[PDB]
C-alpha cells in the first residue's frame with residue numbers, strides 16, 4: 001500500500017520499472033525475499049564483467065540452509081541495460097536438467113542472481129589442477145555429461161553461444177552443469193574474448209565455428225563445434241587451443257582445412273568425433289543426441 005513497505009511481488013514493479021510487463025510476471029515467479037538469503041560479501045568466489053560472485057545462504061520452505069553462489073550485477077550501471085539482461089536470460093527459469101546450471105531466484109543496487117553453489121569450481125580449472133588425478137575414462141565422462149545437458153538445451157531451441165570448459169561447473173558430486181548462459185552469462189576469463197566493435201558482441205574466437213566468425217550468426221550447429229573444442233580441452237586437461245595461432249589468423253587456419261591435432265591421450269574414435277563436429281558444413285555436423293550416442297559407447301568400452 002505504501003512506498004516504503006510494498007509487497008515482495010510488487011517490488012518487481014518498483015525496483016524494475018524498465019522491464020517488459022511480460023517480463024515483470026516472468027521475474028515475479030522467481031523472486032527471493034531478502035530475509036531468506038544472506039550474502040557473504042566477505043569473500044568473492046567468482047569475478048565476471050557484470051560483477052562478482054559471492055557465497056550465499058538461501059533459506060527455503062523449511063529453515064534448511066542451502067549454500068549458493070550469488071552473482072552480483074553492480075558493474076552494469078545502466079538500469080536499462082539491466083532490463084535487457086533480464087530479457088535475455090529469464091527463460092532459464094523454464095530449464096531443468098541435471099547437466100544444466102539451474103537458477104534459484106532473483107533477489108530485489110542491481111538485482112542478485114542466485115545460483116546453486118558449485119563445490120569444485122569450473123570444469124577447466126579442475127582438469128588443470130596439478131593435485132587432481134582424473135583418468136582417461138573420467139574426462140570422457142565429463143564430456144558425456146555436457147553433451148546431455150547440451151542435448152537438453154538444444155531441444156529447447158536454445159543457442160548457448162559460449163560452450164567451453166571454462167563455462168561448465170562441478171558440484172560436490174562432480175556432476176557437470178553447462179553454465180555461463182542467461183543470467184549466468186558473462187566473461188569469467190577475459191583473455192579469450194574479442195569484443196566486436198560495431199555489434200557489442202563478445203566473441204570466444206578459439207571456440208567459435210568458422211561460419212560464426214564470418215557472419216556472427218550463432219546456431220545449434222555452432223555449439224557442436226564448440227563442444228569438440230571442449231572435448232579437446234578435456235583430453236589435453238585444459239590446454240589452450242591453438243597456441244601457435246593467434247586470434248587473427250585463426251580464420252586462415254580453419255579455411256585451409258586445418259583443425260586441432262589429436263592429443264597424446266585421446267582415443268582415435270573420440271578424436272574422430274571431434275573432427276565431425278568441426279565439419280565445414282554446419283548441417284553435416286553431428287547432433288547432440290548423436291553425440292551422446294557416440295560418447296557413451298566410447299565411455300563404456302576401453
Ligand SMILES: Cn1cc2cc(C(F)(F)c3nnc4ccc(-c5cnn(C6CC6)c5)nn34)c(F)cc2n1
Pocket residue numbers: 045046047053068069071101115116117118119121122125166167168169179180181184185188189
Ligand atoms: C563456487 N561457485 C562459483 C560459481 C559461479 C557461478 C557463476 F559465476 F554464476 C557462473 N555461471 N556460469 C558460470 C560459468 C563459469 C563460471 C566461472 C567462474 N569462474 N570461472 C573460471 C575463471 C574461469 C568460470 N561461473 N559461472 C555459479 F553459477 C555458481 C558458482 N559456484
